[PDB]
Specification:
The chain is of the alpha+beta class and 153 residues long. The chain is built from 3 helices and 7 strands, in the order ββββαβββαα. It has a single domain, classed as Nucleoside Triphosphate Pyrophosphohydrolase, CATH 3.90.79. 18% of the residues lie in helices and 35% in strands. Strands 1, 2, 3, 4, 5, 6 and 7 form a 7-stranded mixed beta sheet that branches. A hairpin with a 2-residue loop joins strand 1 and strand 2.
């Protein structure tokens, strides 16, 4: 039966700057939000928090849900891409724990919106959606009667 590739992404914002990971996709250096694929026995925010750590070394929970984007990539892969928002009081050190990621760069909104080296068109959309200022609670895409442990206090 049909099953879409489910992904999560984070808009990490601090001091008027957005966090962006660089990645070499067959021969070209492209930018994306700290993002990746959802795994088995995993909550969507747990996926987002994990991917954030794997790609950037930053350890922080998602705060608000922004939006989900349903789209097909040019390789014909169908995605359900869940975007989250993270505000940090200040810019912090980054270090990828993923050989896929070359470096991280704290970059302005205009620098992304006008960039020509984005992983996908959703990189720019994620900024447009964040700039609107519309944010939603994490519960509205939350787990239900979840069997595994999740967090503490």
């Amino acid at each position: 039966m049909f099953k879409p590739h489910v992904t999560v992404a984070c808009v990490v914002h601090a001091e008027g700057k957005f966090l962006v990971v660089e990645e070499t996709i067959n021969g070209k250096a492209l930018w994306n939000q700290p993002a990746g694929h959802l795994e088995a026995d995993e909550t969507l925010v747990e996926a987002a928090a994990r991917e954030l750590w794997e790609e950037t070394g930053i350890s922080a929970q998602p705060q608000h849900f922004i939006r989900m984007h349903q789209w097909i990539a040019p390789d014909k892969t169908p995605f359900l891409r869940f975007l989250f928002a993270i505000e940090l009081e200040q810019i912090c050190p980054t270090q990828p724990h993923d050989s896929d990621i070359d470096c991280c760069r704290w970059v302005s909104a205009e620098e992304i919106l006008q960039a020509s080296n984005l992983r996908s068109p959703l990189v720019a959309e994620s900024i447009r959606c964040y700039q609107s200022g519309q944010r939603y609670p994490l519960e509205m895409i939350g787990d239900f009667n979840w069997p595994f442990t999740k967090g503490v206090i």
